[PDB]
Design a protein around this ligand. Sequence first.
Ligand SMILES: CCCCCCCC/C=C/CCCCCCCC(=O)O
Length: 283
Amino acid sequence: AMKLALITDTSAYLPEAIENHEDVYVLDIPIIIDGKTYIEGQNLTLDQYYDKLAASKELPKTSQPSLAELDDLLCQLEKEGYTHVLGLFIAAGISGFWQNIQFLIEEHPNLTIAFPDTKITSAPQGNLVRNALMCSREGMDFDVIVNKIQSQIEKIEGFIVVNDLNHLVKGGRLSNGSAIIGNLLSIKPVLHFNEEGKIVVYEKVRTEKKALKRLAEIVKEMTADGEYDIAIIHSRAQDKAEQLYNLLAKAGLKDDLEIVSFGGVIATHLGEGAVAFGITPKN
Ligand SMILES: CCCCCCCC/C=C/CCCCCCCC(=O)O
C-alpha cells in the first residue's frame, strides 16, 4: 500500500491539474538582488522582479533551495504516513542542489526515496511531476514509475535562444561560457541541454529570424520519435514566442503546444527577452 509524495522546486512549471495536488510539495528557490528581494510569491512579484532587474547595476543570483527545508519536509512526510518519495528537482548541471541532497536518502531510512537527475527545468520538469502522478494513479510500482520517469528524462529536450548572453555567461550556467563568449556576441546561437543536463551551444545561428526558424525545425526533428507535450517558454518575449508558435503551427504541431512564462529564477540566468522550447514524452 504505497502512499507516494512528490517533491519539486519552484523552477518546475506545473500543469494546471497538478498545481494544488495534496501529494505535491514545492521547495522555494531564493533570488538575490542587492540582498533586496528574495522569494517569488511571498516577497517578490514577477512585475517587481523585472523592475528590480532593470534598476540594479549588478546581476541577480539565485541560491539552492534549503537542505534544511527538504530535511524537515521528509521527516514530516514520514509521520504524515507517506511510504515513498519521488524528488524531481532542477538539473544537476545548472545547480549543485541535486548532488547536495543525495546524502538525505540515507538519513531517512523509513521512506523509499528516489531523486533522479531531471536534467531539465521549467515545463518538462513540471510534466515529469504530473506524469509520475498519473503513473501512481495507474497502480504502478515505485521502481517501475522511477523507471518510466528516468527513460522520460532521456527524451526530454530543452532549446533556448537568448536576447543577451551576459546572464548565461556571468551567472555561469552556460558551460565554458567565459572562453566562448567573444565568439557568440555578434550572433544568435541556439542553446540546449546536454546529455549531462548542462547548457551548451547547439548551433551558431547568425540572425534572430533564422534562430527562431531553426528552433521550429529542431522541434520537428526531436519529436519525430513519439508523442510529446511541447512548451514554448519565454521571459517577456511574447512576440518571439507567438512567432515560434506560428512556425510550429504551420509545421503541423499546434495540438500539444502551449505558451508559458519563466519566473525570476530562470529570468535571472537567461535574461529578459529569452525564448525556449521544452518537450516531454506523453505518459
Ligand atoms: C525547457 C528548458 C529551458 C529552461 C532553461 C533554464 C536555464 C536557467 C538556469 C537556472 C539556474 C537556477 C538555479 C537555482 C539554484 C541556485 C544555484 C546556486 O547558485 O548555487
